[PDB]
Paper text:
Poly(ADP-ribose)glycohydrolase (PARG) and (ADP-ribosyl)hydrolase 3 (ARH3) are the main hydrolases of serine PAR- and MARylation, respectively, thus playing a pivotal role in signal silencing following DNA damage. ARH3 is the only known enzyme to reverse serine MARylation and is consequently responsible for the regulation of hundreds of ADP-ribosylated proteins following DNA damage. In contrast to PARG, the active site of ARH3 contains a catalytic binuclear magnesium centre. To understand the impact of the ARH3:substrate interaction on reaction efficiency, we crystallised ARH3 in complex with the chemically synthesised substrates: histone H2B peptide (aa 1–11) MARylated on Ser7 (H2BS7mar), dimeric ADP-ribose (dimer) and α-NAD+.
Furthermore, we solved the structure of wt Latimeria chalumnae ARH3 (LchARH3) in complex with meADPr. Interestingly, while we observe an open conformation in the H2BS7mar- and α-NAD+-bound structures, both the hARH3:dimer and LchARH3:meADPr complexes adopt a closed conformation. H2BS7mar and meADPr act similarly to chelants via the 1″ and 2″ oxygens. The interactions with either H2BS7mar or meADPr increase the Thr317-MgII distance by 0.9–1.6 Å relative to the ADPr-bound state, which breaks the coordinating bond and leads to an unusual five-coordinated distorted square-pyramidal geometry around the Mg2+ ion. The importance of this step can be observed in our LchARH:meADPr structure in which the ligand engages with the magnesium centre, but fails to displace Glu33 (Glu41 in hARH3) from MgII. Therefore, meADPr can act as an inhibitor of ARH3 instead of being hydrolysed. To assess whether the 1″-O-methyl moiety of ADPra1:n had an influence on the reaction, we performed inhibitor studies utilising free meADPr. Our results indicate that the latter acts as an inhibitor of the ARH3 reaction with comparable potency to ADPr.
Numbering used by the authors: 8 to 209, 228 to 353
Write the structure that this text describes.
């Protein structure tokens, strides 16, 4: 049962890789698997280290981590402060057009309720973007109890994403990492775990997305086009978090298009990015799930050395592991 440092480090490094590599194709509407496979080859031969920069996905991931270390019992005010101060420090990391206002509002003295800026988004409807899920992995790595994972995924997500679609997307991504983490579950048990939890929480949309995943996994050679059409590859959590989960699950086996000299974590990241659209966020999420599942053994030296801040990430993984051991 017990989660290893290799799993915590794997998840965080998987998350970093997915963001840094996915970022190179973000928003390019026609992205082809051939471009990704050529990208990876170039990457492996780069002489200089640290050439791939992380984006807001990692900036927000680090703020989550720093809040949990400072306030292990979960302090949404501390976390809110860290999101806003990181934005203020490095505003060009690639934040969504909507979420900038929450950070600007949190930095002002006008709000005492840290959830209120998020409540105000889109004419009071709140954001359904995937920004809550892109950064949420560390909750499942820090809190062994699945209920803490659910409630803290929601509250952390709700700092910016007040639509149920946003925060239920965050809960689902946290759950996927949570269940990926405990053992090496089989595809069917993992999905059964996920379908069961989301039924309770719903996020209805996400539940039926999980059903579509079951169907797809029961087929072979499903074209990208069917996955993009049915699961999505968009900015919305509904159109990215299930897609991240599918990429992970699919790449548990050989994909005929990806050379099988790439390991599962590499395949997952490669496959994820090939879906196009919001490539940095879908890959960071799929990479977190795969990293938690397969661990650091599949985070290869040549891949990880190419990301900005890999060392700080590895360090932060050690501190997350120590805080996971404190909760046991
Ligand atoms: C560079 O890629 C970055 O954006 C990705 C997402 O990040 P985010 O979710 O943190 O940001 P935001 O909360 O701003 O929602 C993002 C955008 O979704 C749209 N939108 C959402 N709900 C909406 C709603 N109810 N009505 C109308 N429009 C809505 C808006 O166009 C909004 O501007 C991530 O991959 C990140 O790095
Ligand atoms: Mg990004
Ligand atoms: Mg993005």
């Amino acid at each position: 049962p017990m989660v290893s440092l290799a799993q915590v480090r794997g998840a965080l490094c998987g998350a970093l890789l997915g963001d840094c590599m996915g970022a190179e194709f973000e928003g390019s509407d026609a992205v082809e698997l051939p471009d990704v496979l050529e990208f990876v080859r170039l990457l492996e031969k780069e002489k200089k280290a640290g050439t791939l920069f992380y984006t807001d996905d990692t900036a927000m991931t680090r703020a989550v981590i720093q809040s949990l270390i400072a306030k292990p019992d979960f302090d949404e005010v501390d976390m809110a402060k860290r999101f806003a101060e990181e934005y203020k420090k490095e505003p060009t990391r690639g934040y969504g057009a909507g979420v900038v206002q929450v950070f600007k509002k949190l930095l002002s003295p006008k709000y005492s309720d840290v959830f209120q800026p998020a409540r105000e988004q889109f004419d009071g409807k709140g954001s359904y973007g995937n920004g809550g899920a892109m950064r949420v992995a560390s909750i499942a790595l820090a809190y062994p109890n699945i209920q803490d994972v659910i409630k803290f995924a929601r509250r952390s997500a709700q700092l910016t994403h007040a639509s149920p679609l946003g925060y239920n997307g965050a809960i689902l991504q946290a759950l996927a990492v949570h269940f990926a983490l405990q053992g090496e579950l089989k595809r069917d048990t993992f999905l059964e775990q996920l379908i069961g939890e989301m039924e309770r929480i719903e996020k209805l949309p996400f539940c039926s997305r999980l059903k579509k995943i079951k169907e797809f996994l029961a087929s072979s050679n499903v074209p990208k086009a069917d996955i993009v059409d049915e699961l999505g590859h968009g900015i919305a959590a509904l159109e990215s978090v299930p897609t991240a989960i599918y990429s992970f699950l699919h790449c548990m086996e050989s994909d005929p298009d990806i050379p099988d000299l790439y390991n599962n974590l590499q395949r997952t990241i490669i496959y994820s990015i090939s879906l196009g659209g919001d490539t940095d966020t879908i890959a960071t999420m799929a990479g977190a799930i795969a990293g938690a599942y397969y661990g650091m053994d599949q985070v290869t030296p040549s891949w990880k050395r190419s990301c900005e801040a890999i060392v700080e990430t590895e360090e932060s993984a050690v501190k997350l592991y120590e805080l996971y051991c404190k909760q046991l």
